[PDB]
Structures are given as C-alpha cells and as structure tokens.
Amino acid sequence: DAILDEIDDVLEENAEEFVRSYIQKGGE
Amino acid sequence: MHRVMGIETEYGISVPHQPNANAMAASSQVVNAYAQARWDFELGLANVILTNGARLYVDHAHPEYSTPEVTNPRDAVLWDKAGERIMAEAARRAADLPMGWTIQLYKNNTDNKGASYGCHENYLMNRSTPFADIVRHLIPFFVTRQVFCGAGRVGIGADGRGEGFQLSQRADFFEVEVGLETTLKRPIINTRDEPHADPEKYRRLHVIIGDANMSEIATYLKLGTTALVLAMIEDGFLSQDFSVESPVGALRAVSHDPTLRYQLRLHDGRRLTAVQLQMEYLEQARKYVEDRFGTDVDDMTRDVLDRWETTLVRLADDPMQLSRDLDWVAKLSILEGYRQRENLPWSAHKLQLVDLQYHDVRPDRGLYNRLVARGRMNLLVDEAAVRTAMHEPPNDTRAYFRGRCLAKFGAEIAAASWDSVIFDLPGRDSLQRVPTLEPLRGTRAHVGDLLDRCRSATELVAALTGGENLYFQ
Ligand SMILES: Nc1ncnc2c1ncn2[C@@H]1O[C@H](COP(=O)(O)OP(=O)(O)O)[C@@H](O)[C@H]1O
Ligand SMILES: [Mg+2]
Ligand SMILES: [Mg+2]
Ligand SMILES: [Mg+2]
C-alpha cells in the first residue's frame, strides 16, 4: 500500500547494523 | 474528571559512530542543551525545572521528562506530548554543542536485548484507602489493560530470543506481584509512596507497568481508565473478586497472545479473556458513575467511559479496525504489511527496526510521526496546544506557580521541586524557601493575579510571606 512506501522512504539505513547496535542501559 | 496525576517517561538514547560518547554524557547533553533552575533535593546529575512546571533530568543513563501535575487525562496527554517535542528539540540543540553529537531518542521501553526502561504513571489518592484493596483490585486490571495500552513488541521473552509479536514491551520484565523495585525483579504493583504533599492526607500511587505510548488515544485511555478504577477502589465500590491465578504468568501470556483469546483463570472459577475482564471493570465503572452522579457526569468522564467501551467492543470484534487509535495495532499493521509484501519471518531484522523506529521522536523519521503526517492516526489534542504546553504550565495545579515563577523570575530562582520554590533575592543573606505542599493550591486562581502584579521576585516574596497557609497550603 501507499503507507509502506512512506515508511520505506524513512527507515534507518544499514538496518541490521542499526538493530544490532541499539543497546540500552537498564532504567526503571 | 479530577484526579492529580503525572507521567514520567525515560527515553531510549542512541549516539551512533561516536566512540567518546556514553549514555550519561549523551543524556546530559539533551537535558543541558534544552535549558533554567536546578532541582531542590531538600553525584548531582543534570536536572532542570521547565517553565511549564515539568522536570527534565538524567535518570539511570536516560533523559527523563516528568510532566507537571495535571488534573485529568486530556491534560496528561497534552503535557506528555509536549515532552516528546521537548526531547526532539533538545536533541536538535545538542547537535550544535561543541561535541557535535547526533543523538537519537526513542519514546519506548526496551532495546529488545534484555534491557528495559520506564514510563511511570503517578496518581494522587486518599491515604486512608487500604493498600490491600489497592493491590487486589489493580493487579487484574493491570494484567489486562495492555489490550489497549500496549505499544507492541517484536520478540518474545526478556532477551528477545522467542519468535513472534506481543502486545507489550514491559510484560516480559515483570517478575513479582508487589514490591519496591523499579529496575529488576519488577512488581506489578510498586509500593513506593512519596507524595511530595501532606503524607497525613495523601498517597501517591506510583505505577510502573505501562508501556510508553505514542498514540494520544492510548495514553488518554491508560490514564483515564486507571483513574476511574482508582475512584472505585477508594470508595470500596468493587464487591467482586477479580483476582487471577498466577498473575505474573498471566501478564506474560496475555501479552504473548495478540489474537486476544487467552483465558485468565479467576480465583472465583470464571475463565475470561483479558478483553472480557476489562469489560467487567468498565461495567462497574459505568455503575459507579451512574450511582454517584446520575446524568450529572462531567463530559470527560463520559468520554473516557465511551472510548473505553468502544475500544473493548472493537478489540473483541476485529482488533485491526483500531489501527488509527492503538499503538500495538498501528505497529502491527505496518509489520504485517512488510511480512506479506516481503515474505518475512518474525525474526527478520527489518521488523525489529520498524518496532524501534516507530518510537523515534523525530517528526521526519519516526514512524508514528509519519503516520500522523499522512493522516493515518487519530489525535486527541491539536499541535498548537502541544506547543503552548511546552512552555506554559497547567492552570489548575501548583505547577502553575512553579512554571510561571521560572518564566518570570527565573534569574532569582535558586532551585525548585514538586513541593518547593527557592528564591535568591538580591541583598539577602539567605535563601527563601516557599513550600508548595498542596497539589491543588498555588493555581492560577490562587496566585495568578498576585504574579501579574509583582514586578520583582522581592515584591512577590514580600506579598507571600506569612501567607503560605493562604496561597499554598
Ligand atoms: N502529589 C502528587 N500526586 C500525583 N502525582 C504527582 C504528585 N506530585 C508530583 N506528581 C507527579 O509525579 C511525577 C514525579 O516525577 P519524578 O520527579 O520523575 O518522580 P520519581 O521520584 O518517581 O522519579 C511527575 O509526573 C509529577 O507531576
Ligand atoms: Mg522519575
Ligand atoms: Mg526514572
Ligand atoms: Mg517514577
């Protein structure tokens, strides 16, 4: 659909690198 | 509707390609790049009070925004959304600091790798309400309200190693029914009671189980339905026993079944889905309001009840018709579209990216924000009021005095907190601590004209001295 093209336009580059690097400290 | 409430949100924070960065430094840049006066505690991390009465500070290596005290769930939505705008602007300003870091912020609750961080709700209640009633009536409600409060998550289990989609980010991190913890072994009911108000009168209920929501409808329902249930508990209205077997196990089982068919086993023998149990709370809330007020119900209470019922009816019918209202449904609709279009299994990295970037605060890159930009999400408040709420406090709580003081006399405010404002007057040896102990005093109706007339903080402190038990308590 049309909205998946909007999402595709803005998704972060290097998706697998991005996901693997998204590492957070524990909070509350 | 009227109950003092507020929302704290810890934001995920990412600074890629900067080996000098750590989360504490990045979070400090966000807080410091936005702004004001420092926190009155009565290692000191970056911590500021904003002119809308909110707190912006570094907590547990995350930047955290805590709304001003508000009196109803629409205002909770408004000042919480102002928080998102403040975070986005803070990060943009941080990019102009000498270090030049590109900082990404996420209004979510997990990195999908075993770490979670918190969106807390705070509710002012009668000290006299017995805590055992608070626990036994809220646990089943909190176990099930994720059917409309959940923000969605790709990956099952705290470590994310199970394949699939679930309703809530927080559920896998909860381990016990009741306790003090907020960072590990988390309890469904957190017991900390720090009202920053008269502890002879008030309890502050500190709720930690909810996901941060992007959707304004989801945040409105989360705060509004919980406040209605709290009124029932305070009044001893609930005569049924809603308790369930293994409530921590049921919280996870509910989250892990987005078809909404899993049945809770109630101690009284009933077997109900989470949607069905929510309908039982809604029906009691309707009876409570009818019994108490008749048709003399305020419009917001009627609206919360109507939206609560309409949402539960649509959830039982076909949850995908709620893709404009609920976060997990809006997210799931994108995820399933990619799964169909590209034949992706639930372990695909692209689905993890959608799960996370949905919560990106950038207006041009965050997926929720893109949905809003294309008219694909229902809104509760309009953007002009959100922008105003970034810098103006609510009129009907003590945040009014706090925020307006900072806006008008900021240079002479040494420090502030939820229950104090501390003035540094020129020529004065000492600091002047003005206590603001009652959440519903220090409002515009109490001090707005006084603040209007005063041209200096010295004039204001003169007008207020000996009048603390008029303006603030
Ligand atoms: N008396 C009260 N009742 C309910 N909520 C309150 C009261 N006083 C302050 N709050 C709200 O509680 C939250 C406190 O935030 P914060 O200072 O981050 O708390 P914590 O110590 O839990 O991290 C804010 O949203 C604030 O508006
Ligand atoms: Mg906090
Ligand atoms: Mg916190
Ligand atoms: Mg908290």
3-state class (DSSP) for residue B391: helix
Q: Determine which helix (DSSP H) or strand (DSSP E) holds B340, and give its type and residue range.
A: helix B327-342
Note whether residue B275 is domain-resident. Answer: yes
Handedness of CA B244, B248, B251, B253 (dihedral sign): negative
Is B110's Cβ below 8 Å from some Cβ in A?
Answer: yes
Asked whether B40 and B416 are in contact (CB, 8 A), the reply is yes
What does the alpha-carbon distance between residue B343 and residue B337 come to, in Å, rounded to a whole number? Answer: 10
- Number of domains present in the structure of chain A: 1
Distance from CA of B58 to the nearest CA of A (A): 11
Neighbouring C-beta atoms of residue B371, cutoff 10 Å: 23
Note whether residue B218 is domain-resident. Answer: yes
What does the alpha-carbon distance between residue B274 and residue B251 come to, in Å, rounded to a whole number? Answer: 9
**Cβ burial, residue B263 (10 Å; 0-12/13-18/19+):** middle
Nearest-5° angle of CA A16, CA A21, CA A24?
135
What does the alpha-carbon distance between residue B94 and residue B398 come to, in Å, rounded to a whole number? Answer: 30
Q: Is B383 annotated as a binding residue?
A: no
Note whether residue B3 is domain-resident. Answer: no
For this structure, is B291 an active site residue? no
Is the Cβ pair B338, A18 closer than 8 Å? no
Is the Cβ pair B117, A11 closer than 8 Å? no
What does the alpha-carbon distance between residue B272 and residue B261 come to, in Å, rounded to a whole number? Answer: 9
Pocket of ligand 1 (CB under 6 A): B 4-8, 55, 66-69, 120, 122-124, 195-197, 202, 204, 206, 418, 439
Note whether residue B471 is domain-resident. Answer: no
Question: Chain A: residue nearest B61 by CA?
Answer: A25
Domain that holds residue A12: 1-28
- Number of domains present in the structure of chain B: 1
Experimentally, how was this structure solved?
A: X-ray
What is the phi/psi pair of residue B211, to 5°? -70, 145
Handedness of CA B25, B88, B13, B114 (dihedral sign): positive
Asked whether B364 and B210 are in contact (CB, 8 A), the reply is no
Asked whether B123 and B205 are in contact (CB, 8 A), the reply is yes
3-state class (DSSP) for residue B72: coil
A7 interaction partners in chain B (CB closer than 8 Å): 334, 354, 367, 370
Q: Which amino acid is at B69?
A: E
**Which of B150, B96, B334 is closest to B260 using CA atoms?**
B150
3-state class (DSSP) for residue B199: coil
**Cβ burial, residue B16 (10 Å; 0-12/13-18/19+):** middle
Domain that holds residue B342: 18-465
CA dihedral B41, B47, B48, B52 (to 10 degrees): -90
Note whether residue B194 is domain-resident. Answer: yes
A11 interaction partners in chain B (CB closer than 8 Å): 350, 353-354, 357
Sequence-distant (6+) residues with CB within 8 A of B278 are: B141, B144, B145, B147, B148, B308, B312
Tokens of B202: 């008030």
Q: Is B368 annotated as a binding residue?
A: no
SS3 of chain B: helix, strand, coil, percent, to 5: 45, 20, 40
How many angstroms is it from B194 CA to the middle of ligand 4?
10
Asked whether B62 and B11 are in contact (CB, 8 A), the reply is yes
Asked whether B247 and B140 are in contact (CB, 8 A), the reply is yes
Which of A5, A13, A22 is the mutation pick for testing B, counting most B CBs within 10 A? Answer: A22
Is the Cβ pair B113, A23 closer than 8 Å? yes
Handedness of CA B105, B46, B78, B121 (dihedral sign): positive
